[PDB]
């Protein structure tokens, strides 16, 4: 009883945002709370931010 089917494949690209759950390999979870600016992050003696 169906005449024809049209299947459309969209390809969305989800980058990252607060609320996206991230975890390690040892049962440690967490939802991103802020996409901090690069200049606001902690940096070591060499200036490389974490």
């Amino acid at each position: 009883g169906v005449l024809k089917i049209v299947k459309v494949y969209l390809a969305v690209k989800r980058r990252i945002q607060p609320g996206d759950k991230m975890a390690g390999r040892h049962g440690n979870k967490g939802v991103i709370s802020k996409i901090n600016p690069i200049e606001d992050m902690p940096y070591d003696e060499n200036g490389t931010p974490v």
């Binding site: 390809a11 980058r15 600016p37 200049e39 200036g47």
Partner: protein, 218 residues
């Protein structure tokens, strides 16, 4: 009264990362100016990242071209890291035409003398067979910060914009035993750019930005 710091040395270690010196500096002003300039540099430095890319036989970035070892997405990712300097025009359109086996690098772009490619060895893609060719148009514009393609024909592929020549900034405050006076600070700022900005020009722009923001109440 206060001694005014000034640019005394630009110690070019390599093509990318340089090390400028500010001297003399009073007690505490070294860290203040170092952190302020670090934040300004990492925040707001004009850059010339790619914005749009158009390959002839490509409709969307999730496809492939015959004879190209890389997916279109990986080509766009490689272009996203392309370091380029434009002088006269805020917006330019470079062209890349290559045919034959081998690594299609950034050196195969049309010269366009008003545009400088700082890393000619920057590989863009690989061609696998003689009869395979890539003919593509790249759109390079001036900008500031990070402008994801989502915020801003069906053949145009948008690449995320990364208008930020700086990559790493580190300031060290040392002792400057100069002018027959002790406990004067020297601010050595080591900055690792992508090669598209002059370190002296970068410091000048950062200081100008800070002064303009500070003019609101002085």
């Amino acid at each position: 009264e206060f001694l005014k710091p000034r640019l005394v040395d630009i110690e070019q270690v390599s093509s990318t990362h340089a090390k400028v010196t500010l001297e003399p500096l009073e007690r505490g002003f070294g860290h203040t100016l170092g952190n302020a300039l670090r934040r300004i540099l990492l925040s707001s430095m004009p850059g010339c990242a790619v914005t749009e890319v158009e390959i002839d036989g490509v409709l969307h970035e999730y496809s492939t071209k015959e004879g190209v070892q890389e997916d279109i997405l990986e080509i766009l990712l490689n272009l996203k890291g392309l370091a380029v300097r434009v002088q006269g025009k805020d917006e330019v359109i470079l062209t890349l035409n290559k045919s034959g086996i081998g690594p299609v690098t950034a050196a195969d772009i049309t010269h366009d003398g008003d545009v400088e490619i700082v890393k000619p060895q920057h590989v863009i893609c690989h061609l696998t067979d003689e009869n395979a060719s890539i003919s593509m148009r790249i759109k390079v514009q001036r900008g500031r910060g990070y402008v994801p393609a989502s915020t801003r024909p069906i053949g145009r592929l948008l690449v995320d914009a990364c208008y930020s020549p700086v990559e790493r900034i580190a300031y060290n405050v040392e002792a400057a035993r100069v002018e027959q006076r002790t406990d004067l600070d020297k601010l050595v700022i080591e900055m690792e750019t992508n090669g598209t900005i002059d370190p002296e020009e970068a410091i000048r722009r950062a200081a100008t930005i800070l002064a303009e923001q500070l003019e609101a109440f002085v």
